[PDB]
Design an enzyme around this catalytic site. Sequence first.
Site, PDB file in Angstrom:
ATOM      1  N   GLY A  44       0.773  -1.258  -0.070  1.00 20.46           N
ATOM      2  CA  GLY A  44       0.070  -0.177   0.073  1.00 20.46           C
ATOM      3  C   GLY A  44       0.829   1.146   0.041  1.00 20.46           C
ATOM      4  O   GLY A  44       2.186   1.086   0.287  1.00 20.46           O
ATOM      5  N   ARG A  45       0.253   2.254  -0.310  1.00 19.76           N
ATOM      6  CA  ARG A  45       0.801   3.833  -0.289  1.00 19.76           C
ATOM      7  C   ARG A  45      -0.146   4.683   0.493  1.00 19.76           C
ATOM      8  O   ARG A  45      -1.508   4.513   0.375  1.00 19.76           O
ATOM      9  CB  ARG A  45       1.183   4.185  -1.733  1.00 19.76           C
ATOM     10  CG  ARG A  45       1.477   5.758  -1.680  1.00 19.76           C
ATOM     11  CD  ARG A  45       1.386   6.422  -3.125  1.00 19.76           C
ATOM     12  NE  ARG A  45       2.573   6.188  -3.583  1.00 19.76           N
ATOM     13  CZ  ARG A  45       2.996   6.620  -4.885  1.00 19.76           C
ATOM     14  NH1 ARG A  45       1.809   7.234  -5.759  1.00 19.76           N
ATOM     15  NH2 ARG A  45       3.943   6.280  -5.389  1.00 19.76           N
ATOM     16  N   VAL A  51       4.360   0.841   1.880  1.00 17.91           N
ATOM     17  CA  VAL A  51       4.549  -0.354   2.549  1.00 17.91           C
ATOM     18  C   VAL A  51       4.731  -1.586   1.697  1.00 17.91           C
ATOM     19  O   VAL A  51       4.012  -1.550   0.709  1.00 17.91           O
ATOM     20  CB  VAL A  51       3.464  -0.613   3.696  1.00 17.91           C
ATOM     21  CG1 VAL A  51       3.473  -1.804   4.351  1.00 17.91           C
ATOM     22  CG2 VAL A  51       3.337   0.396   4.872  1.00 17.91           C
ATOM     23  N   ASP A 154      -4.484   8.664  15.644  1.00 20.11           N
ATOM     24  CA  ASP A 154      -5.003   8.125  14.125  1.00 20.11           C
ATOM     25  C   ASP A 154      -5.591   6.987  14.317  1.00 20.11           C
ATOM     26  O   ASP A 154      -5.351   5.854  13.401  1.00 20.11           O
ATOM     27  CB  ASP A 154      -3.807   8.136  13.320  1.00 20.11           C
ATOM     28  CG  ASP A 154      -4.367   8.172  11.900  1.00 20.11           C
ATOM     29  OD1 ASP A 154      -5.478   8.699  11.717  1.00 20.11           O
ATOM     30  OD2 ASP A 154      -3.432   7.898  10.904  1.00 20.11           O
TER      31      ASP A 154
HETATM   32  C1  LIG Z   1       1.164   2.125   7.600  1.00 23.87           C
HETATM   33  O1  LIG Z   1       2.206   2.315   8.650  1.00 23.87           O
HETATM   34  C2  LIG Z   1       2.343   0.863   8.948  1.00 23.87           C
HETATM   35  C3  LIG Z   1       1.897  -0.261   8.397  1.00 23.87           C
HETATM   36  C4  LIG Z   1       2.139  -1.364   8.686  1.00 23.87           C
HETATM   37  C5  LIG Z   1       1.710  -2.933   8.071  1.00 23.87           C
HETATM   38  C6  LIG Z   1       1.081  -3.009   7.002  1.00 23.87           C
HETATM   39  C7  LIG Z   1       0.674  -1.966   6.136  1.00 23.87           C
HETATM   40  N1  LIG Z   1       0.059  -1.000   5.341  1.00 23.87           N
HETATM   41  C8  LIG Z   1       0.842  -4.511   6.489  1.00 23.87           C
HETATM   42  O2  LIG Z   1       1.542  -5.372   6.988  1.00 23.87           O
HETATM   43  N2  LIG Z   1      -0.147  -4.669   5.665  1.00 23.87           N
HETATM   44  C9  LIG Z   1      -0.333  -5.869   5.260  1.00 23.87           C
HETATM   45  N3  LIG Z   1      -1.397  -6.143   4.365  1.00 23.87           N
HETATM   46  N4  LIG Z   1      -1.488  -7.456   4.047  1.00 23.87           N
HETATM   47  C10 LIG Z   1      -0.522  -8.382   4.717  1.00 23.87           C
HETATM   48 BR1  LIG Z   1      -0.620 -10.236   4.401  1.00 23.87          BR
HETATM   49  S1  LIG Z   1       0.308  -7.454   5.658  1.00 23.87           S
HETATM   50  C11 LIG Z   1       2.981  -1.741   9.991  1.00 23.87           C
HETATM   51  C12 LIG Z   1       3.472  -0.498  10.666  1.00 23.87           C
HETATM   52  C13 LIG Z   1       3.142   0.703  10.296  1.00 23.87           C
HETATM   53  O3  LIG Z   1       3.409   1.703  10.971  1.00 23.87           O
END
Ligand SMILES: COc1cc(/C=C(\C#N)C(=O)Nc2nnc(Br)s2)ccc1O
EC number: 2.7.11.1
Length: 328
Positions: A44-45, A51, A154
Amino acid sequence: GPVPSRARVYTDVNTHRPREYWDYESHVVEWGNQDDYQLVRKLGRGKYSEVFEAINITNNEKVVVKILKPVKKKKIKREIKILENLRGGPNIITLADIVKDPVSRTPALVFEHVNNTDFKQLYQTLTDYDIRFYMYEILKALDYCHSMGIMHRDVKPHNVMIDHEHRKLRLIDWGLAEFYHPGQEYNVRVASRYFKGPELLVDYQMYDYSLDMWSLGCMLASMIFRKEPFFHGHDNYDQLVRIAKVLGTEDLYDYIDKYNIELDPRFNDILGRHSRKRWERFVHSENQHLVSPEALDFLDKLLRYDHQSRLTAREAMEHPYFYTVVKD
Ligand SMILES: COc1cc(/C=C(\C#N)C(=O)Nc2nnc(Br)s2)ccc1O
């Protein structure tokens, strides 16, 4: 001027911690090895990061990599310091490593991998028991970070990861989180619109952990009533009007009068007069299996205008709504 406000709990946690604990600007990052991580796919963005799923090739385990977008080094060090302070806490996403990304020229945060179930599939399936169980798991994370002097700011469904197979929950994206210092004025441009507390929407800056409890109440309302989002404002002004159509305008005036707040005069043509409603009006045949007297009383005690009147996270965990949840 505005009447000052203090948190009713955990008020002086950071004054009695050593300075290094909250002085994130002086934090010295310990950098790991950037080649330890093979990116697999983009997850994702957001406005502040991208990420990625990755493999840690040193232990052959899955991780997730959060490559931060260019923002002031203070917000970057703030998030890093908060993640290190909270690491090991219940249902707090675990920061595993921090590396320098050579392309973005910014830090990449490495986290534990949570096998996230689809958030749309999730809320359409959650049973009454599941909602109570996961709300309790969120409360563990919030009481922990509040007890550690930190407000998340948040809380929303996208920042709650749930692996439904293993009933495992993590609170993520600490990029907006802050240290609570009594008397400090904070930015009100935090949280997503539908989860913004009344304190943000009336521009009251001396807020505290109780902001997260309003956001939690908004999530609870959306889950037990099957309405996403619950307070569905078109902008930040309409957001407060939507809240006032439920909590009523007399208690909104009581709130702002207690703190010597004035509403934006643009509310004169849009706010109107509204009685306070009873939560039963939102129950119907397609959500009634998720609603109970206990659910409505709990929700009622989270969704208060007055941030000083909301349940704290620990008080929420004592609520009869959770009596049916099996405790470890
Ligand atoms: C945006 O900030 C954060 C994100 C994350 C983690 C994910 C996101 N996006 C994530 O693991 N998504 C997943 N989607 N499918 C699987 Br299978 S894992 C962890 C700490 C953060 O501070």
